[PDB]
Amino acid sequence: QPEPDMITIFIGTWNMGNAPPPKKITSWFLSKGQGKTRDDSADYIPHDIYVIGTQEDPLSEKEWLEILKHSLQEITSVTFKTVAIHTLWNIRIVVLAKPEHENRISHICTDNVKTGIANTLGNKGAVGVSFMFNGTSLGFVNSHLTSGSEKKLRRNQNYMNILRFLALGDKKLSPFNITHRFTHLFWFGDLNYRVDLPTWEAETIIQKIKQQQYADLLSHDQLLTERREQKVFLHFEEEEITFAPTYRFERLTRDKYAYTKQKATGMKYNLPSWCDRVLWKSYPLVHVVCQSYGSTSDIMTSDHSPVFATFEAGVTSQFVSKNGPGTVDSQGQIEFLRCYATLKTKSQTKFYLEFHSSCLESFVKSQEGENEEGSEGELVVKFGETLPKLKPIISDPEYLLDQHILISIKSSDSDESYGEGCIALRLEATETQLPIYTPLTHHGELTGHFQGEIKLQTSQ
Ligand SMILES: NC(=O)c1cnc(C(F)(F)F)nc1
C-alpha cells in the first residue's frame, strides 16, 4: 500500500449558542449550503481528517463524539478513529481520522490558552491539537475571541496571546511559536470580527445580504481590514467569502438576523457579521488548496450557522536511507552565500542564526554576524559567506527538496529570538546559487527580513 502524497482535511467551526444540535448535521460535513460548496459527486468520499471546532458547546465530550462519529458513519459508512479531543470551558476541538491513518499519526499534542485578565479571564481562549501525519506536521487551533463590534483590538491581543502561549508541536523548536512549527497550520473559530458599519445601516446590510451582494460588506469586515494593516494573522490565507454572514440569526429559522440591542446582548447591536472563520498558514511551496468554504443553511439551533472549509494538503512519507536517520549522508549539503538579516530593532547587540530542520540531526548555531547601519536607519546583520554548511541526514532529492529550514536570529547577549522565518528547499535547481528570502516575525509581528543565496547538493 503506497503512502499518500496528498490528503483532504475537513475543518468545521460552529458556535452552538449553548443549545443542543438538531438530529441531522450531515450538511456540515458534506460542505453543503452557501458559499464555495463541495460537488455532490464527492458526498460518499470520506476526508482523511475531520477537525471540528465548537464554541458555546453545551455537550459533554462523550455526547458530542457520539453525534460526530454517528454522523460521519451515516455519510461515509466509515467508523472514524478519535485522534484527540480537548475542551476549555465551552470551547472544544475534536480530531477524527480514517482508520487506515492510525499507523501514520504520531506525536499527538493538545493545549489551551485562556485569554484576558480578571474581568476578561473566564470564558474566551483557544484549544489546539497537533500531530505528525507521516513526515508532515499538522496544527489545528480553535479560538473563541472577545465579542463586540468595538473590541477588534482585544481580539488582536487575544490572537497574539494564543500564538505566543499555545504549546503544540515539537518542543525542540524552542525559538518558534505555532506559526512556524507546522507544515500546515489551520486556525479557525468564532473569531468575532464584525462588519464595521453604522448601526443605522442594519436594514441596508440585511437588504444587501438578501441580494447576495457581499462586496460592500466584506470591505468593512474587521478581520480583512485588520489583516490588510498587518495587525493580526500576518502571513495567513483565507479563501474568498461567498456566503452570507453567519451571525446573528434568530434561532429555528435562517430567514431573520437578530441585530437589535437587548438586555441579553448587554445593550449591544450585533450587525450581521462573518464571526466564524477558517484561515491557514503552510510552509512555502507546499501544496495546499482550499476546495470548499461556506456555511450550512439547514442547522438552526444556534444564533450562528456552522462554517465548513476543506483542503487538499501535500504530505510526505517517513523517509529511511542506509545513512540517516541516525547519521548524516555526506552526498548532501546546504550552503548559504551573501546572507544578511535586516531587523527593525532599535537595539545594538551582536546576533547569530540558529537553523532548525528535521533534515538535520540537531539545530545549528552560526557565528555572530557583522552589524551595519542600513541607508534608511535599519540594522543590517551581515553573515556574508560565514554561515555553516548544513549536513542533512538524507541526500536523496526526493526527500531533501521537500524539506524546510527554520531560521531564528538571536541576541548573543540574551539568546532571545528577535525574528523567526522559514526557507523551502523546493529549489528550481541543485548545485546552483539561488536567491532565498523569508520575512522574520516575533510573537507573530514583523521584525525584519532574511535574504541571501542558497546552494543545495543532493545525491542526484
Ligand atoms: N500514535 C497514536 O497514539 C495514535 C492514536 N490514535 C490514532 C487514531 F485515533 F487515528 F486511531 N492514531 C494515532
Q: How far is the CA of 130 from the centre of ligand 1 (A)?
A: 12
Quoted resolution (Å):
1.5
* Atom number, ligand 1, closest to the C-alpha of residue 101: 10
Pocket of ligand 1 (CB under 6 A): 81-83, 97, 101-102, 105-106, 108
Residue of 50, 93, 102, 109 with the most ligand 1 atoms within 8 Å of its CB, for mutation: 102
Could you tell me which of 8, 83, 6, 5 has the C-alpha nearest to residue 45? 8
Ligand 1 center–CA 83 separation, angstroms: 5
Q: What are phi and psi of 232, to 5 degrees?
A: -160, 155
What kind of experiment solved this structure? X-ray
Ligand 1 atom 3: residue of nearest CA: 106
Smallest CA-to-CA distance from 51 within 183, 185, 145 is with 185
User: Is residue 20 classed exposed, middle or buried when 0-12, 13-18 and 19+ CB atoms within 10 A define those classes?
Assistant: middle
The answer to whether 452 and 436 have CB atoms below 8 angstroms apart is yes
Ligand 1 atom with least separation from CA of 107: 1
Task: Compute, in angstroms, the gap from residue 36 CA to the centroid of ligand 1.
Answer: 31
Q: Which residue has the cell 542600513?
A: 374
**Ligand 1 center–CA 181 separation, angstroms:** 20
Strands, sheet with 91-97, edge to edge from the N-terminal-most edge strand: 34-36, 288-295, 307-314, 6-15, 49-55, 91-97, 81-88
Collapse the DSSP code of 420 into the 3-class scheme (helix H, G, I; strand E, B; otherwise coil) and give the result. strand
Contact (CB, 8 A) for 420 and 180: yes
Q: How far is CA 395 from CA 29, 330, 363, 366, in A?
A: 41, 8, 18, 22
Cell of 327: 547519521
Pocket test for ligand 1, best of 93, 105, 129, 318 (most atoms within 8 A of CB): 105
Cis peptide before 325 (omega within 30 of 0): yes
Residue 321 Cα to ligand 1 midpoint, Å, equals: 25
Say how many CA atoms lie within 13 Å of 19 toward its Cβ. Answer: 16
Cβ atoms 113, 121 nearer than 8 A: no
The SS3 of residue 125 is strand
Q: To test ligand 1's pocket by mutation, which of 9, 68, 80, 81 has the most ligand atoms within 8 angstroms of CB?
A: 81
Using CA positions, which residue lies closest to atom 11 of ligand 1? 102
Query: With the CA atoms of 178, 279, 285 and 405 taken in that order, what torsion angle do they form, in degrees rounded to the nearest 10?
Result: -10
Closest residue to atom 10 of ligand 1, CA basis: 102
Q: How would you label 276-305 residue by residue, b for 16+ Cβ within 10 Å and e otherwise?
A: bbbbbbbbeebebebbbbbbbeebbbbbbb
Contact (CB, 8 A) for 305 and 295: yes
Question: What is the tally of helices (H) and strands (E) in the chain?
Answer: 7, 21
Residue 218 and residue 238 in contact, taking contact as beta carbons nearer than 8 Å: no
- Between CA 305 and CA 416 the distance in angstroms is 43
CA of 132 to the centre of ligand 1 (A): 10
Are 360 and 390 in contact, with CB atoms under 8 Å apart? yes
| Residue for grid cell 549539503 | 333
